[PDB]
Amino acid sequence: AQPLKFIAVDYSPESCTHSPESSTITLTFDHRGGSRWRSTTRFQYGTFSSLIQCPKGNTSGLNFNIYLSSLEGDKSQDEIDFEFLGKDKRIVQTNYYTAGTGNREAIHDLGFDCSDGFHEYVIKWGPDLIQWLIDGKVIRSVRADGEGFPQKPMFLYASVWDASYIDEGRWTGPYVGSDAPYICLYKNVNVPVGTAVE
Numbered sequence: 644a645q646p647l648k649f650i651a652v653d654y655s656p657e658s659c660t661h662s663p664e665s666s667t668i669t670l671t672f673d674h675r676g677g678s679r680w681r682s683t684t685r686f687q688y689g690t691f692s693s694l695i696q697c698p699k700g701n702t703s704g705l706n707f708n709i710y711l712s713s714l715e716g717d718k719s720q721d722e723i724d725f726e727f728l729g730k731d732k733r734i735v736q737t738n739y740y741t742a743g744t745g746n747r748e749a750i751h752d753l754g755f756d757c758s759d760g761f762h763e764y765v766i767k768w769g770p771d772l773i774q775w776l777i778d779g780k781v782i783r784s785v786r787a788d789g790e791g792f793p794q795k796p797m798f799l800y801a802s803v804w805d806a807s808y809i810d811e812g813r814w815t816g817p818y819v820g821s822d823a824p825y826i827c828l829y830k831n832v833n834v835p836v837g838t839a840v841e
């Protein structure tokens with residue numbers, strides 16, 4: 644594993660702040676919206692990790708995340724996700740996509756408030772096994788079957804966005820915004836050294 648130091652920012656770069664000397668990338672959500680960072684290379688399998696401290700206060704409406712995707716915006720994509728749902732800061736959702744088909748959501752109870760400090764989130768991606776880990780514990784394991792598996796090379800992505808418009812607000816809640824600016828911290832992001840492609 645190696646630190647990720649070369650990133651790209653896909654929109655609203657003034658809402659993404661990188662402090663290389665502290666190995667910390669910070670995404671802000673406020674009246675300007677949010678932002679999204681990514682690796683500049685794709686990867687073909689490997690282990691991906693980050694310390695994450697989610698935003699303070701009433702995060703209803705917001706989605707903050709870290710995920711692998713073959714290309715954000717593509718509708719036939721492969722993906723592996725961690726997504727925090729802002730109305731409940733004591734859960735995280737995992738999911739994965741195969742050629743544009745998802746619908747494999749699972750909700751996990753964290754046992755902590757995801758904004759209380761840094762916690763470690765890890766995705767291990769292989770051709771027949773994917774694991775999600777939180778603070779060193781496997782929380783989900785999936786194996787390849789006839790129903791598809793993520794195999795395209797993928798970028799590492801993270802964003803904060805207002806998802807309150809999704810499913811009439813049932814997914815992340817209405818956006819209240821009482822505690823803007825919301826700041827999500829990503830520290831010690833680590834990506835595979837030898838399966839980067841590109």
Ligand SMILES: OC[C@H]1O[C@@H](O)[C@H](O)[C@@H](O)[C@@H]1O[C@@H]1O[C@H](CO[C@H]2OC[C@@H](O)[C@H](O)[C@H]2O)[C@@H](O[C@@H]2O[C@H](CO)[C@@H](O[C@@H]3O[C@H](CO[C@H]4OC[C@@H](O)[C@H](O)[C@H]4O)[C@@H](O)[C@H](O)[C@H]3O)[C@H](O)[C@H]2O)[C@H](O)[C@H]1O
Nearest residue numbers: 654655674675676679706708715716724726801802804805
């Ligand atoms: O949750 C992570 C991940 O989970 C998977 O399950 C899913 O497959 C992924 O798509 C999802 O990724 C995140 O998706 C959101 C929503 O966008 C997606 O669906 C809609 C489609 O339009 C997108 O292409 C998909 O990516 C995404 O958040 C949005 O990203 C947009 C950019 O692609 C943002 O639009 C941009 O906003 C800029 C800022 O200003 C505008 O928005 C804020 C307003 O205040 C302002 O008035 C607007 O002008 C614009 O400058 C820019 O032109 C515009 O393109 C959008 O705001 C944002 O919500 C996450 O980034 C992504 O990680």
